Design a binder for this molecule. Structure first.
Ligand SMILES: *[C@H]1O[C@H](CO)[C@H](O)[C@H](O)[C@H]1NC(C)=O
Ligand SMILES: *[C@H]1O[C@H](CO)[C@H](O)[C@H](O)[C@H]1NC(C)=O
Length: 7
C-alpha cells in the first residue's frame, strides 16, 4: 500500500 502527498 501507499499514501498520497501528505501536506
Ligand atoms: C499510494 O501511492 C502509489 C504510488 O503510485 C499509488 O498512487 C497509490 O494509488 C497510492 N495509494 C493511495 C491510497 O492513494
Ligand atoms: C503518504 O503518507 C505516509 C504517512 O504519512 C507517508 O508520509 C508517505 O511518505 C506519504 N507519501 C508521499 C508520496 O508523500
Amino acid at each position: 500500500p501507499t499514501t498520497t502527498p501528505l501536506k
